[PDB]
Amino acid sequence: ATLFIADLHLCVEEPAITAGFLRFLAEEARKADALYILGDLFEAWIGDDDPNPLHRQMAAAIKAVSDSGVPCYFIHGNRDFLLGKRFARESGMTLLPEEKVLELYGRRVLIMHGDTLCTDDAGYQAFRAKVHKPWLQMLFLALPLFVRKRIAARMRANSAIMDVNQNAVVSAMEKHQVQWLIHGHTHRPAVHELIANQQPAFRVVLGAWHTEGSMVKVTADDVELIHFPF
Ligand SMILES: CN(c1ccccc1C(=O)Nc1ccc(S(=O)(=O)N2CCN(c3cccc(C(F)(F)F)c3)CC2)cc1)S(C)(=O)=O
Ligand SMILES: [Mn+2]
Ligand SMILES: [Mn+2]
């Protein structure tokens, strides 16, 4: 079975999520064929050099999973788009592109964070357009940690998540010719039915973690959205 999670928003002052993720890693993920983390693993990311002890501990925990024989893959979310190759090495994760098609037990499944589907949110898409320019990322990362942190305090006070655009959903699923899509971002967990490629299709939406978690579990038999206790 292949597992998908997203929208953990890990944060020092949300210890229930930290504990729940550590358990998931030790119990569920160790038994999987593969683990995919579809963005917003962290509440915020200002660079791989951040000395936050949470990052040390979470990297070692994820790396224990891939070091055990279970590959771990990451797609960036809007919160953690700066997570880079240094932290990918620390955590034993492979970084994926924005959109990726998997072939799982016969079935072709598109995965993404989901923010690129929220095409009606003008402010968000403008924000996203700038902060994804490599040259600008390199300048922000060159700033001192304490400056990066003050900037990030503003930007989060300043920032209710707009839901996906249906034309964007269908366009992505027809571009990749898939009948299955898994994403997060919107924090509205559900299995939706729709039409893509003039056939039945499914859009499976992960939930954010707070007092419990969610995963999608993919087997040859089934695609299941599972909501599970800490
Ligand atoms: C859907 N979200 C939004 C909606 C509208 C507008 C923005 C967002 C959004 O994701 N905001 C948001 C995302 C991440 C963060 S952060 O992790 O604290 N941090 C903030 C500092 N960032 C940064 C700022 C300028 C240039 C560059 C650079 F590029 F130079 F590195 C990077 C790096 C990321 C802070 C704010 S929401 C409601 O969750 O906040
Ligand atoms: Mn999220
Ligand atoms: Mn998001």
Check if 227 has its Cβ closer than 6 Å to any atom of ligand 1.
no
Check if 208 has its Cβ closer than 6 Å to any atom of ligand 1.
no
CB 48 within 8 A of CB 86: yes
The two structure tokens encoding residue 51: 């000395």
* Closest to 196 in 3D by CA, of 176, 216, 217: 176
The three state secondary structure string of 193-204 is EEEECCEEEEEE
Pairing label, strands 212-218, 223-229: antiparallel
Alpha-carbon distance of 211 to 228, in angstroms, equals 10
- The response to whether 68 counts as a known ligand-binding position is no
Domains of the chain from N-terminus onward: 2-229 (3.60.21.10)
**Nearby residues of 159 by Cβ (< 8 Å), 6 or more positions away:** none
CB 182 within 8 A of CB 158: no
Alpha-carbon distance of 54 to 74, in angstroms, equals 18
Alpha-carbon distance of 78 to 115, in angstroms, equals 7
Sign of CA dihedral 56, 58, 64, 65: negative
Place of tokens 């098609």: 101
**DSSP class of residue 156?**
H
CA separation, residue 84 to residues 7, 80, 95, 102 (Å): 18, 9, 8, 22
118 CA distance to ligand 1 centroid (A)? 15
Strand partners, 128: none
The two structure tokens encoding residue 144: 């001192």
Alpha-carbon distance of 104 to 130, in angstroms, equals 35
Alpha-carbon distance of 67 to 60, in angstroms, equals 10
**Measured at the alpha carbon of residue 226, what is the angle toward residues 222 and 229, in degrees to the nearest 5?**
150
CB 216 within 8 A of CB 204: yes
Helices (H), the chain: 15-27, 53-67, 85-91, 122-131, 134-142, 145-158, 166-175
Method: X-ray
Instruction: Tell me, in Å, the resolution of the deposited structure.
Output: 1.9
- Nearest ligand to the CA of 207 is 2
| Percent of the chain as helix, strand, coil, to the nearest 5 | 35, 25, 35
Give the Cβ contact number of residue 122 at 10 Å.
9
CB 80 within 8 A of CB 41: yes
The two structure tokens encoding residue 193: 């039915």
- The response to whether 7 counts as a known ligand-binding position is yes
Sign of CA dihedral 157, 125, 41, 190: positive
186 CA distance to ligand 2 centroid (A)? 7
CB 100 within 8 A of CB 78: no
Alpha-carbon distance of 230 to 186, in angstroms, equals 22
Check if 58 has its Cβ closer than 6 Å to any atom of ligand 1.
no
